[PDB]
Amino acid sequence: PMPLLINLIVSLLGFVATVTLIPAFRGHFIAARLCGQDLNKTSRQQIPESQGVISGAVFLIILFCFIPFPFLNCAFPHHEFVALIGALLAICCMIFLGFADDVLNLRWRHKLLLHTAASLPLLMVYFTNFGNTTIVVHLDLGILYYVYMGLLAVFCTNAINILAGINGLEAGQSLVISASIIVFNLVELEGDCRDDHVFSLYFMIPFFFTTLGLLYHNWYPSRVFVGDTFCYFAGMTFAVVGILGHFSKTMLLFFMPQVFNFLYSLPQLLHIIPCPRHRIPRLNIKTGKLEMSYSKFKTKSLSFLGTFILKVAESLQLVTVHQFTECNNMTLINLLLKVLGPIHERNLTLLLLLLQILGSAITFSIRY
């Protein structure tokens, strides 16, 4: 089709724009103190933080210019245009919130409230355009359905965020997921539901190419860091395409390593097991590779429920406790390291991307 072709053109041009603009603005970011040190590397220099903003900005630009082409000589259909503009509002709000958060370092409560408020537009569009709240069981979920979507949105913004820390991972898994969703959209295009999946494509192709431009700089050695800007941006874009596309189940299935990491980290997130500020592997100076990390805490003080959960985990061979208590920091990165010992940062990132691809293949096998 012409719309998809134009979309691809502007998407490639936007990729070029991102790759070009990142270094042009480096001085700006550095002067603004928007930078962070590579915690998993020996050098202690600063590295541009919240680079996603540039990519994010470009992304918006692209869509802002691409809105008209689907409607060339098309009683105008205000509802599809409403879907587009509302989705763009949600995404823009989320990019803006991520950039703000990185500069300001907001507490978790602030984060969650702003996530919900910025997620409302998705519910607006969904209600006005589609507004179906029934799941096969056939039970009509009602208001709770909206809640679900809401939560889903939040999840997508924060899940990708917590599965981070090693060089190049964030944008990498984001790209794998985006590509899988693109393939799924193209397959289902010939099927019964075609408009939903071409919408998902409209939003996915430019995201894919811009995120690629960002990963170009973010790959090991990381010359830049993407930050909450990008994390929340990608999360919300995925939530949008999945919700308005009516394949949130397939998407969540694409979110397998993310879901597993989130649930695995759930005791720390809820303060059951003490949650350090940074829960990433520790580079061993001698090895030249990433070992696991631990949470050290006074044993007796811990709540009873926490001790019980930790004992269950030790029974299941998930946590390598060294009883003070030194529990193994529970993130997917550290779990891969525990199963396969010390791994180089680049190699570990690559392994994680490959596992994501395997999850996508499993999902495709389930659907088909």
Ligand X SMILES: CC(=O)N[C@H]1[C@@H](O[C@@H]2O[C@H](C[C@@H](O)[C@H]3O[C@@H](n4ccc(=O)[nH]c4=O)[C@H](O)[C@@H]3O)[C@H](O)[C@H](O)[C@H]2NC(=O)/C=C/CCCCCCCCC(C)C)O[C@H](CO)[C@@H](O)[C@@H]1O
Ligand Y SMILES: CCCCCCCC/C=C\CCCCCCCC(=O)O[C@H](COC(=O)CCCCCCCCCCCCCCC)COP(=O)(O)OC[C@@H](O)CO
Q: Cβ(118)–Cβ(236) under 8 Å?
A: yes
DSSP readout, 296-334? Answer: EE-TTTS-HHHHHHHHHHHHTT-------EEEEP-SHHH
Integer Cα distance of 203 and 185 in angstroms = 11
x-or-dash string of contact with ligand X, 170-209, rule CB under 6 A:
----------------------------------------
Instruction: Please tell me whether residue 282 adopts helix, strand or coil conformation.
Output: strand
Picked from a second copy, ligand Y, ligand X, none, the partner binding residue 109 (CB below 5 to 8 A depending on kind) is: ligand Y
Query: Tokens 């001790």 sit at which residue?
Result: 307
Integer Cα distance of 63 and 8 in angstroms = 12
C-beta of 91: minimal distance to a second copy in Å?
Answer: 10
x-or-dash string of contact with a second copy, 114-133, rule CB under 8 A:
x--xx-xx--xx--xx----
Integer Cα distance of 232 and 102 in angstroms = 11
User: Is 108 an interacting residue with respect to ligand X (CB under 6 A)?
Assistant: yes
Is the Cβ of residue 85 or residue 179 nearer to ligand Y in the bound state? 85
Q: Cβ(332)–Cβ(261) under 8 Å?
A: yes
The closest alpha carbon to 346, from 169, 164, 227, belongs to 169
Q: Cβ(225)–Cβ(49) under 8 Å?
A: yes
Integer Cα distance of 56 and 100 in angstroms = 13
Query: Tokens 């690629």 sit at which residue?
Result: 212
Give the one residue of 35, 47, 53, 333 binding a second copy; rule: CB under 8 A. 53
User: Is 300 an interacting residue with respect to ligand Y (CB under 6 A)?
Assistant: no
Integer Cα distance of 291 and 360 in angstroms = 27
User: Is 33 an interacting residue with respect to a second copy (CB under 8 A)?
Assistant: yes
User: Is 61 an interacting residue with respect to ligand Y (CB under 6 A)?
Assistant: yes
Picked from ligand X, a second copy, ligand Y, none, the partner binding residue 349 (CB below 5 to 8 A depending on kind) is: none
C-beta of 152: minimal distance to a second copy in Å?
Answer: 18
C-beta of 148: minimal distance to a second copy in Å?
Answer: 19
Q: Is 24 marked as binding a ligand?
A: no
Half-sphere exposure of 246 (CA within 13 A, CB side): 18
Q: What angle do CA 184, 189, 194 make, to 5 degrees?
A: 120
C-beta of 86: minimal distance to a second copy in Å?
Answer: 5
C-beta of 175: minimal distance to ligand Y in Å?
Answer: 20
User: Is 93 an interacting residue with respect to ligand Y (CB under 6 A)?
Assistant: yes
User: Is 154 an interacting residue with respect to ligand X (CB under 6 A)?
Assistant: yes
Picked from a second copy, ligand Y, ligand X, none, the partner binding residue 32 (CB below 5 to 8 A depending on kind) is: a second copy
Integer Cα distance of 220 and 146 in angstroms = 40
Is the Cβ of residue 77 or residue 276 nearer to ligand X in the bound state? 276
The binding site for tunicamycin A1 comprises 39, 105, 161, 228, 279
Please give the annotated binding residues for dolichyl phosphate, written as ranges. 111, 154-162
Q: Which residues bind ligand Y (CB under 6 A)?
A: 21, 24-25, 27-28, 53-54, 57, 60-61, 64, 93, 96-97, 100, 104, 107, 109-110, 113-114, 117-118
